[PDB]
C-alpha cells in the first residue's frame, strides 16, 4: 500500500507528465524500443521504423503514447482502487497482445528514466521510490488479473 505522501509524489510528478503528454509517450516508447528492442516486435504497426528520427516523426506512435499515458494515468489517480480502470487493460494485455509482466517491467523502467531526465528536480529518491512502488502496485495486481483469465505471462 503507498502512504498518502507517497501518493502526493506520484501526483506531482504526473502533473509534470501532462504539461505534455504526447512528448513524454514519445519518449518513453522509444526508450523502451532502445532498451528492450523486443518490445518492438509486439507492435506490427510500428516495427517498420528503424530509427529514432522515423519513431519520432511518426504520428501514429505518437498518438499512442498518448493512448498509452492517459490509462497509466488514469489508474495511478485511482490511488490503488484502480479495478475498473485495470480490468479491460489486463483483458487486452492478457489475451490480444499477450504482454508478459517482464515486458511491463520493462517500461516501467522507461517511464522512471523518461520522467528524471525531464524532471530532476521534482523527481529525486522520495519521488522515484514512490512512482517505483506505484509502478509495482499496478504490475502486481494487472498480474492477479493475467491469470484471472489464464494467462501466466
Ligand atoms: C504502462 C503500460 C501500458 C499501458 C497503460 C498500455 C495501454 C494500452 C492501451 C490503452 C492500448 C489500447 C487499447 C487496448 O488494446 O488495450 C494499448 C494497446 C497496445 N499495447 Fe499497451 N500498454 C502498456 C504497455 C504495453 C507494453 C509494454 C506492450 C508491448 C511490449 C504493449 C503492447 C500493446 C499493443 C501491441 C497494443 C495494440 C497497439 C495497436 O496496434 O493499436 N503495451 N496499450
Known amino acids: 500500500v503507498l502512504s498518502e505522501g507517497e501518493w502526493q509524489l506520484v501526483l506531482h510528478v504526473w502533473a509534470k507528465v501532462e504539461a505534455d503528454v504526447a512528448g513524454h509517450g514519445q519518449d518513453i516508447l522509444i ?32 498518438k499512442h503514447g498518448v493512448t498509452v499515458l492517459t490509462a497509466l494515468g488514469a489508474i495511478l489517480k485511482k490511488k490503488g482502487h484502480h479495478e475498473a480502470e485495470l480490468k479491460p487493460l489486463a483483458q487486452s494485455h492478457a489475451t490480444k497482445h499477450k504482454i508478459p509482466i517482464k515486458y511491463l517491467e520493462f517500461i516501467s523502467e522507461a517511464i522512471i528514466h523518461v520522467l528524471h531526465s525531464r524532471h530532476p528536480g521534482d523527481f529525486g529518491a522520495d519521488a522515484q521510490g514512490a512512482m517505483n512502488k506505484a509502478l509495482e502496485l499496478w504490475r502486481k495486481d494487472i498480474a492477479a488479473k493475467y491469470k484471472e483469465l489464464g494467462y501466466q505471462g
Open 31 to 62: 526508450r523502451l524500443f532502445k532498451s528492450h528492442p523486443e518490445t518492438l516486435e509486439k507492435f506490427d504497426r510500428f516495427k517498420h521504423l528503424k530509427t529514432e528520427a522515423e519513431m519520432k516523426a511518426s504520428e501514429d506512435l505518437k
